[PDB]
Subunit: 542 residues, 3 copies
């Protein structure tokens, strides 16, 4: 069946010369194409995108003169306020509280409404209060003279309950600078670059307009970019995020991979002591004095700077473009769908019985009846119960698609399709000579109301009973045809049924399932009788 392989099925189409429908089609196509191109270009859907692999290296710079009422002036440098960047973050100490000479011993705990005692009964041995850095020994002792407080085993003397200094000791930390070196890679695209390129000015400091590509940031500038007071956030500390966004196109014609610097405060501006506002931690400087292990505890407050590097690098990928085009292809059939919907809707008689009289504007849309008739063809399932009846008086045909069960087809009305016995209205029918189960089918008249019969019509005699015509029809199909007398009569009788059905019902779709009236049936049978036997009747083709 190689010939079956080498076959191409092309749809049958109707081409309409309509201003409106062609204009609609082209408008739809232009709009769809424009949106598809716009989406492709704007979202770069032709590109395979890869997240950035980043490495950050910071260099902080600046010294601070610190005033401490002990008054003494001291200079702090990088070794004293910062530690090298770890995990894309660096910390600059802005403030501190110091507690010198701590030994692991037993000491009276610093007085507070909790630790104040009036007798030994107010303390419990081994009690770990969450707001304490020690474990009670059960007895309370003098802190300073009159005042009695719970004794604890801990690093002693205990820290004073004091607030962070105001102003911050390292308030000059706003004039410090940080140089950020950012290296990025797209391993899939095998593209690595960096934020500092040859020819970049190193004598600059970042400004979002003047110097938007300078990687040297003054911390005060950052805070101002974000809308915060460095002098205030310095007192208790904070977290600031330096976002480096990489929107990179790796196509060599449209190549562009530069960073965009932005800033965002990352700590909640909470004043709730319960939530530990700011950013601080306790750091121990261990040492030895007089063979005793001692500790200087610094409560460090500062600002942690987080370098948040994110972005994508895109490069043209054939497969992504293919996928996007394939997804968008089906949107070009919507013009056809919409116009076919219009043709189907405006083909309904409802749109002229009611709609047009009200809205006369839509009257010219009646042409869609022509488009529908030239577009759609309707066919019914050729079931064995399917039947068609035509009445000469009536101006149409009836599709009786229901079982005739003890009910004459004359009285069994069905759906409306366009082009002596009690049930007889022409006076030329005979009772059905067939099984009473199916007699009702053959109990049909040429008409619904009394009057003349259609077997009297002069056309019937010449379009159904004319022997010359029927024999010529037989010869047309079979030029050299010879038959017995009975065979000739049978061939003629079947041709007569065929010709009547074609005459009254037209198309062969309805003439195959047509039903002849009893009058015409028996007239034809009389004209072309059979030698012996009984006539079978109607037989459904399928």
């Amino acid at each position: 069946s190689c010939s079956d392989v080498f076959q191409y099925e092309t749809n049958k189409v109707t081409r309409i010369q309509s201003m409106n429908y062609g204009t609609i089609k082209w408008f739809f196509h232009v709009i769809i194409f424009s949106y598809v191109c716009f989406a492709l270009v704007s979202d770069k859907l032709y590109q395979r995108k890869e997240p950035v692999i980043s490495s950050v290296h910071t260099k902080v710079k600046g010294i601070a003169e610190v005033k401490e009422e002990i008054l003494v002036h001291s200079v702090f440098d990088t070794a004293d306020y910062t530690f090298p960047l770890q995990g894309n973050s660096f910390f600059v100490m802005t403030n501190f509280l110091k507690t010198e000479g701590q030994e692991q011993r037993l000491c009276p705990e610093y007085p507070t409404r909790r630790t104040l005692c009036s007798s030994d009964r107010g303390c419990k041995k081994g009690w770990m209060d969450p707001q304490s850095k020690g474990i009670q020994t059960g007895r309370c002792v003098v802190y300073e003279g009159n005042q009695k407080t719970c004794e604890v085993s801990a690093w002693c003397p205990i820290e004073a309950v004091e607030e962070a200094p105001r102003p911050a000791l390292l308030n000059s930390a706003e004039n410090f600078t940080v140089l950020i070196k950012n290296n990025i890679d797209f391993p899939g695209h095998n593209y690595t670059t960096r934020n500092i390129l040859p020819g970049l000015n190193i004598t600059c400091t970042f400004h979002k307009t003047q110097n938007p590509q300078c990687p040297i940031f003054r911390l005060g500038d950052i805070f101002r970019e974000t809308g915060d007071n460095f002098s205030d956030v310095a007192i208790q500390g904070g977290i600031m995020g330096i976002e480096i966004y990489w929107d990179c196109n790796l196509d060599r014609w449209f190549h562009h991979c530069r960073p965009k610097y932005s800033f965002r405060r990352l700590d909640d501006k909470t004043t709730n002591v319960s939530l530990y506002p700011g950013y601080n931690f306790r750091y121990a400087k261990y040492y030895k004095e007089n063979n005793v292990e001692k500790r200087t505890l610094i409560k460090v407050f500062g600002i942690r700077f987080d370098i948040l590097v994110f972005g994508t690098g895109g490069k043209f990928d054939i497969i992504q473009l293919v996928v996007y085009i394939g997804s968008t292809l089906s949107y070009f059939g919507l013009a056809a769908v919409f116009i076919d919907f219009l043709i189907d809707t405006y083909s309904s008689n409802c749109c002229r019985s009611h709609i047009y009289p009200w809205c006369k504007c839509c009257q010219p849309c009646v042409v869609n009846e022509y488009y529908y008739r030239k577009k759609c063809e309707s066919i019914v399932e050729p079931k064995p119960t399917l039947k068609y009846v035509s009445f000469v008086d009536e101006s149409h045909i009836r599709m009786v698609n229901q079982q005739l069960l003890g009910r004459s087809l004359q009285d069994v009305k069905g759906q409306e399709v366009p082009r002596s016995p009690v049930w007889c209205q022409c006076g030329s029918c005979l009772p059905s000579q067939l099984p009473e189960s199916h007699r009702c089918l053959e109990e049909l008249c040429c008409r619904k109301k009394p009057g003349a019969c259609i077997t009297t019509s002069e056309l019937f005699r010449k379009l159904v009973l004319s022997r010359h015509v029927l024999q010529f029809l037989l010869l047309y199909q079979e030029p050299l045809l010879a038959l017995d007398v009975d065979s000739t009569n049978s061939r003629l009788r079947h041709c007569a049924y065929r010709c009547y059905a074609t005459w009254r019902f037209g198309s062969q779709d309805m003439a195959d399932f047509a039903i002849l009236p009893s009058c015409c049936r028996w007239r034809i049978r009389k004209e072309f009788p059979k030698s012996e036997g009984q006539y079978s009747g109607f037989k459904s083709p399928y």
Copy 2:
């Protein structure tokens, strides 16, 4: 050609009134639509998704009483067991081994099966053993009395080969808490939020059911969530991961962005000393005594906690929805594809010659023959070798789509299509008077087996030779038509060929490529001869 632009091609369609096929179509459509909607909703394919940009800040809390057999009790606080979170991780020391008063000197290395010597020959000067922290000087000396061990230059005294203390010195570290503050951003969606919201209870501790949004975690609770013993993992250490998952919908109607906390052990539970089980490191406390640079070495064991923050934030995007709909649109033609497949398959005669007799269930599916005939029209390539022959005796036509090369078309049988000379079976043919290369074409008879001729048929004389009919056919196309005698004969002869071909082959598709038999051809030529010259014969239209 503006009119050519303003054209709409609509497919010709056949509408079938079938219960089965309409039900199948609507079932397919409902299922496809339901699945498309389900996928869109479940995977939120209408949303553009953006990975989370996270910042974590931890605050650990708790003190531990530590027993060391030197027995001495000591209190450890945050300054003694933890360092501020770096890179989304914090470390809590749970155990330690201490080696005090180390000087860079020469010392006997701690005894092991490796370092035990019996003479100086067992050591090599400058030898860096991987299991050693020193470099041999070549000579071995007394470690403690009788026992001789390799001498090394190193920090001395060398560490003892001892196991981590059991129980862990800071085993109370399970009662410590950590408050995690997590800030997240979606820069593309310009949406930042945090894990602690106003009105959240700070007096809580996390419980996956009671307190699933409390960011205060007791370390023992974490280990239990994961199914581990804090007391065991404390001895040698470990790594625990605190996963914060953000499934965030940023649509204001369906907005939801809260974290989901989970826990996962991140260290292999390996007991293989070769793989360095646990988590430990050697930390040096440098100091000065007697103007000598000394070191206290602590082998620190603890649990490193990694805060693993991941997730996506989605917001409705028009383009993503368009793409998804476009991808899913083509699935609505599968009903048509499947039903057309059914109509094509059940139209085959194979499905009734064999299938129906066996499986009588499928007999009612014969109606698809009607659907096929009303659906598909078949046409062959009008090649110059294409030819059609009809034999009056035969009940069909033959498509001889092959070159007749010295072989009379009578004997050259081809494919089966439905509706005196040695090769003559009617006794009314003449030899072909044309080039012998193509004579074989015109060497055709009206029939395949002996008998009468079809030129004798009464229809032929009236449908091919009747001058009145032919002149009327000519006049129909050309009402006022006048011709010369020879021109009249030629017009009539061609009309006779046309009418015979239409009579026997029917459609003009087959009548254009039809071939008249020699008998009929020469009868027609005799009826309508030409004044002079020889008859050309058949000429392929294409």
Copy 3:
């Protein structure tokens, strides 16, 4: 209207038995299918992919003998050159400069072209020079004998301006090893694994061919992999990245999740002192001597190693496959689109008037005229101005789709379609007896140039004026039909218009909008006159 629901519209198609077009269709289909399968397989578009969640744990190993000209030999171990991995990075000190015994005091700043003074006027009190670690007191003092330099408040003595030692003190750091343990998770796929599996050899060191899965890396090996000198990068320092790529398939049949190790230098190989080449930082060792707070400052140079873990884990997802198939489905209609384009193009007369004479190769493609005629049907908008005129002399018909406004239709020529009064060319027409606004329509002749009339044609009399024929046509539609005399004449006259229009214009599409010539119109009206009144004329069906 449940029957309307139970309807299936199937496209009418034409099946072509062409070698070329079937071969083209199957070639297109095979190519499209092959590419779709290839893209699906290669990009694993059936898979849902999830980024990796990673945790890294390093263990560095090795000791270094360090020579310092003070010459003194010292051994450095892990406690002396590295700190535990923080944020997926570890640092190994390779070199250092030491400045012992620093006190916060006033000191002469180290001499440079900047700090050299000749008098007190060269210094400004409180001046913070960016290249200084102190704040000037306004006066300059002796540094060493003759040489005078600006005095500053700072940690003193000030650091010497000296270069990093050559060779690096810890140049043996290339023989150090690092064991990397990498744990990964795909939470969506609920799949966690690790880079070290049971049965892996721990006595190995990484080699990209011999030992590609060993997680023990010698730092010198890394530098060589990247193409760098450890001895040079050690002097000032650097950043090296150890990339661990995870291309993981989580399908149990095709499961594979192993790491791929690669190396990349992450620091710019810049020699520009202005950009701070290398990797170094200043670290303070604080201590106490004689109750004085002192500092040993180490300028640390080393190599920071960044463990860069990236990758995706994919697992089969039904929805992704559905989406991809839906996107690719519309590419299977391109064969139809292309072949229909060919059939439309090769159907044009332009392709035979010009193209074929030049390029005779393309002559056999004329069959596409047959394919077009059997494929496309063209229909015009049935506007009320649409009209068709046929002239017996002419060999075609004219579609006059324009308003006849005071211009006889005889002289109003329109588009070309295939099959006594001054404007009369047959001598058998009469002036139009209708409103002069529309008389011009009825002012049409049977012909364009002088001669006989078509009302004289014998067919016209029998195909338009034969009463027997017309009454038979009426009876065919209405077998039993009785009419009044005037009604009979009207029915016959309209049937005559219908039959002439069908005879001359053929299809009813053109015969509904046909216009009869004045001669034929008035001949028919004379044959079948009306009892009283005036004839209305032509009426557009739509």
